Structure formats: C-alpha cells, structure tokens
C-alpha cells in the first residue's frame, strides 16, 4: 500500500495544467432556471462529484466557449430511458477547470466540472441549432434539527454539548437522547435517525476500505458527507435516481448504510447471475473513495470502482500504459466469462516495488448490486 491516493483525483492523464475557476454560482431553492444540457453525457451526476469531459463535436465546443464567459454552469440529466432521452431529475455541474487544444486540426476541449445542486425537470426544449435547453426547478435541501429539539426540557438544554470510543457512544446516547423517555419511542430508535451516529457507522465501514483517518479526509457537514458517500457507492442507474430524489440528508445516510449492509455481492448487469466481486474486496485507491468518474480518450465517462480481486473475467488484448487513469499501472480490457460484456480493466504495476502489484477497475454502468440468499431489490428511507 504505497501508490498515492492523490494521483487520480488530479486526473494527470488529461495533460498540461488547466485554467481554473473558483467563483461559486449557486441559485436560490425552488427557483426556475433554464440551463443547457450536454448531449453525449449519459452519466448520473451527484453533487460534489468530480466529472472530467473531453469534447470533440463543434457544437459542444461552442457551448463550452459560450459558458466560460457566462455562469460556467450546465445541466446533467439523469436519463431513465437513454434511448428516448427521458429524464425527470438531474444535477447541475459547474466547470472548475478548462483547457482548449487544437491538436490534429480538430477543436479538442478538456473540462473538469463539479456537481452542485439537484433539480427536477419541468420542460425540455430542443433549439434549431441542435443543442438542447432545459427549464428546471431547483430541489431544496431539507435540513432538519436534532429530533430532541421538540421534546428537550429547558433544564437539560445545557447538558447537550459533549467533550474507549464505544464507551463514549454509550454515554452520548444516554445523554443526548435522555428526553426520549418523554416520547412513545426509546433512545436506540432515535440513534438510527441521528446524523452523527449514522456518519460514524459509515466511517466504520469506510475505514475497512481505506486507512485514511476521518479527521481531515471526511467532511463534518452531514449534507456534504452524505453526497460524498453516495458518489462512491457502486449502484445501478435506477437506485441512483431513487437516492437522488431524497431531500433530507438523514434519509440519504440511512439509505446508504442499508445498501452497504444489504448488497454484499456485485454481479454482471447484463448476466444478473454472474458474480464478479464482493464488498470485502472493495478498497479506496483515490481520495474521493473507491469509485470515481474518469474520462477516456473518446469522451466516454466511466464511474470506475477499484477492487482487490475479481472472478469470471477474461482479458482481451495486452497491457498498455496509454492514457492510464492510475499512473504507474497498465490496463487490459476485461470481459464477462458468460455474456462477453465489457466489465472493466485489469491494472498491473509497471515496477516491482509498487504495491499492490495488481488490481481491478470495474465500470459502474456494467455492474449490478445483489443481495445474497433469495429476495428482490428494495432501498429503505
């Protein structure tokens, strides 16, 4: 374990340094905004998630040039049916880095954008020039105070601030949720709906994947924390859409913890029966988490997840280090043993001193989370 988790977050494969922007454009909640949509973006973006893009078509480059001077914000639709271009929800994206290159006589533009706000689609219009616009309504972030705020006795208000971690959590539950005896429910029930307890349980699951401490790497704000956790969870498009619909951070965290405990297997999306890997093999190779969005030479985005071992996969071609997302590793195309559908790539270290010597990178669009034994798919809260 000596690669460097900060290498992929920078997206070094894109080349020379880009012109960065730092001004944050954030619209009011429930406000109606008309924002353009990128055509070849089939990814479902999450707020706070980094998204790299390489555009080739002159229309895309022209739209980017027009946005660089304006608010630098575009929309990313959550295509439920990609064939008919149907989208009920989506996420805004703000360009934070850009660089134009006129290599080989064609206008190439490299852009790094970040998620910002969720939204509900009101109307979709397509202009005469091919590019499409969207009349959208900003979805509000429903922030809720502590469940005890409405029952808390005035005399015990001063005992709400707090200075063996297991012993500390027991004391925390007995003190913060003391007034729970005044309601129809006990303390342990409210503990399931407390942001801090949920964040700590998620932290315990995250430490299992990476040895980076939560003092700096993880944000303290439950809203930003929930969005960061969701952004690196390997789920199918339908479950991602459902999770995005959630307005409260508490429900988002509850759903995330439930998914992390339920879906222990990860099978092929096309096969549905071919098991590829388990959550035991998942580990974080990047600062964002185990899964992150990466762009390829042809502008296709892959929400790739890094795992230790993978099975039922055949390798196509020979290892290459060209446009590699993980510097110092060579990729080899990986296909499913049964359906022959592309699942990801096998990364092999170029040098012997590197550790781990080999790992797997699987694309989210080709995976399916599976619950063991026999049951259907459901996501609580």
């Amino acid at each position: 374990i000596n690669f460097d988790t900060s290498l992929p977050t920078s997206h070094t494969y894109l080349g020379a340094d880009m012109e960065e922007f730092h001004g944050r454009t954030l619209h009011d909640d429930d406000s109606c905004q008309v924002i353009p949509v990128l055509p070849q973006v089939m990814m479902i973006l999450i707020p706070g998630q980094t998204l790299p893009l390489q555009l080739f078509h002159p229309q895309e480059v022209s739209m980017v040039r027009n946005l660089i001077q304006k608010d630098r914000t575009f929309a990313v639709l959550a295509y439920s049916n990609v064939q008919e271009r149907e989208a009920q929800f989506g996420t805004t994206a703000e360009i934070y880095a850009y660089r134009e290159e006129q290599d080989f006589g064609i206008e190439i533009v490299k852009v790094k954008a970040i998620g910002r706000q969720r939204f509900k689609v009101l109307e979709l219009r397509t202009q005469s020039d091919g590019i499409q616009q969207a009349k959208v309504q900003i979805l509000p972030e429903c922030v809720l105070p502590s469940t005890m705020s409405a029952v808390q006795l005035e005399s015990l208000n001063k005992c709400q601030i707090f200075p063996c971690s297991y012993k500390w959590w027991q004391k925390y539950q007995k003190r913060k949720f003391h007034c729970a005896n005044l309601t129809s429910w006990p303390r342990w029930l409210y503990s399931l709906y407390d942001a801090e307890t949920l964040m700590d349980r998620i932290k315990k699951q995250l430490r299992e994947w990476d040895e980076n401490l939560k003092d700096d790497s993880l944000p303290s704000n439950p809203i930003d924390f929930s969005y960061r956790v969701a952004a690196c969870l390997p789920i199918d498009d339908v479950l991602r859409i459902q999770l995005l619909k959630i307005g409260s951070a508490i429900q988002r965290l509850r759903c995330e913890l439930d998914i992390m405990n339920k879906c222990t297997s990860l099978c092929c999306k096309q096969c549905q029966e071919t098991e590829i890997t388990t959550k035991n093999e998942i580990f974080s190779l990047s600062l964002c988490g185990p899964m992150a969005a990466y762009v390829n030479p042809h502008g296709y985005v892959h929400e790739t997840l890094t795992v230790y071992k993978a099975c039922n996969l055949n390798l196509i071609g020979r290892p290459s280090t060209e446009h590699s997302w993980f510097p110092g590793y060579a990729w080899t195309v990986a296909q499913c043993k049964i359906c022959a559908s592309h699942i990801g790539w096998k990364f092999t270290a170029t040098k012997k001193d590197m550790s781990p010597q080999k790992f797997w990178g699987l694309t989210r669009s080709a995976l399916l989370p599976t619950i063991p034994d026999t049951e259907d798919e459901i996501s609580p809260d």
Binding site: P297, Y300, G317, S320, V333, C339, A340, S341, H342
Partner: peptide, 29 residues
C-alpha cells in the same frame, strides 16, 4: 499482427474490423 482496429468505448485492440464491429454491439446490450 499489430491490432489497429480499436473500440472507442473501452479500448479493446482488434486485428480485424469484423471483430471490432461485433464487440461494439456488446456495449449496446
């Protein structure tokens, strides 16, 4: 040979055009 036909989506190297045209249909599903 040298495999000049490549897949724009994943980067699969192929020695023939027929091999590539079938592989691109696998991504469509």
């Amino acid at each position: 040979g040298e495999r000049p036909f490549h897949c724009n989506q994943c980067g699969a190297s192929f020695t023939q055009k027929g091999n590539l045209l079938r592989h691109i249909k696998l991504h469509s599903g």
